[PDB]
Amino acid sequence: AEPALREQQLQQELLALKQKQQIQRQILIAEFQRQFEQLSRQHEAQLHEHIKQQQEMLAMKHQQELLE
Amino acid sequence: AEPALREQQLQQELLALKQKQQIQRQILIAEFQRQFEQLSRQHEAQLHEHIKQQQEMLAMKHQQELLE
Amino acid sequence: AEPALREQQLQQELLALKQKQQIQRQILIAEFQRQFEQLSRQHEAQLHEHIKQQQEMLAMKHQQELLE
Amino acid sequence: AEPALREQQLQQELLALKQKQQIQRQILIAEFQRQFEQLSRQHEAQLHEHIKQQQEMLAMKHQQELLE
C-alpha cells in the first residue's frame, strides 16, 4: 500500500496531537495553580504580619499605659 | 498626638495592602489570560495545519489517482 | 457551481468555528476572573473582620484594665 | 484565666481561617480546571468533526468524480 498507508500516517499524527495538547493544557493549568498559591501565601503572610504589628502598637499604647 | 498617630499609620498601610494586592491579583489573572490565548492560538493553528495537510493527502490520493 | 460551493461552505464554517471558540474562551476566562475577585474580596473581608476582633480583645484586655 | 483565653480563642480562630481559605482556593482552582478541560474537549471534538467532514466533501467530490 502507499496512499492508504499515507492515510494511516495522518490518523496517527492527529491522535498524537490531541494527546500532546491535552498534556500541554494540563501544564498550563498546573503552572497557574502554582503561581496562584504562591501569591496567595505571600498576600496572606503579609496580611498576617500586619496583624502581628497592629498588636504591638495597641500593645505599647496600653501596655506602657501603666507607667503613664 | 503620638500613639493615635501610630494608629493612623497602620490604618493607612492596611488600606494600602488591599489596593496593592487587589492589583497584583489582576496581574496574575491577565498573565494567565495571555498564556491562555497563546496556547489556544498555537494548539489551534496546529489543528488547522493538520486540516490543511490532510487536504493534499486525500487530494493527491485521488487527484493524481485520476491519471492512474 | 457545485463542489466549489460545498468547498467554500466549509472554509466559511471553519473561519466561523474559530471566531466562536475564540470568544467562548474569553467567556470562560472572564467567568474565572469574577469568581476570583469574589473569593478574594470575601477571604479578605474576613481576614479584615478578624483584624477588628483581635483589636477589641487586646483592647478590653487592657482598655478597662485601668479599673483592674 | 480569661483574656489569655480569649487570646487563645482568636489565635486558634485565625489559624483556622487560613485552613478554610487555603482549601476554598483549591476548590476554586479545581472548579476552573474542570470547566477548562470541558471546553477544551468540546472545542476539540468540533474541530475534529470538521475534519471528518472536510473529508467526505473532498471525498465524494472526487470519489464520485470517477463516474463523472
From Swiss-Prot, chains A, B, C, D:
Domain of life, per lineage: Eukaryota
Q: What's the PTM story here?
A: Phosphorylation at other residues by CaMK2D is required for the interaction with 14-3-3.
Entry's disease: HDAC4 point mutations and chromosomal microdeletions encompassing this gene have been found in patients with brachydactyly and intellectual disability syndrome. However, HDAC4 haploinsufficiency is not fully penetrant and multiple genes may contribute to manifestation of the full phenotypic spectrum.
Subcellular localization, per the record?
Answer: Nucleus; Cytoplasm
Quaternary context = Homodimer. Homodimerization via its N-terminal domain. Interacts with MEF2A. Interacts with MEF2C and MEF2D. Interacts with AHRR. Interacts with NR2C1. Interacts with HDAC7. Interacts with a 14-3-3 chaperone proteins in a phosphorylation dependent manner. Interacts with 14-3-3 protein YWHAB. Interacts with BTBD14B. Interacts with KDM5B. Interacts with MYOCD. Interacts with MORC2. Interacts (via PxLPxI/L motif) with ANKRA2 (via ankyrin repeats). Interacts with CUL7 (as part of the 3M complex); negatively regulated by ANKRA2. Interacts with EP300 in the presence of TFAP2C.
- Name of protein: Histone deacetylase 4
The record's comment on protein family reads: Belongs to the histone deacetylase family. HD type 2 subfamily.
Originating species: Homo sapiens (Human)
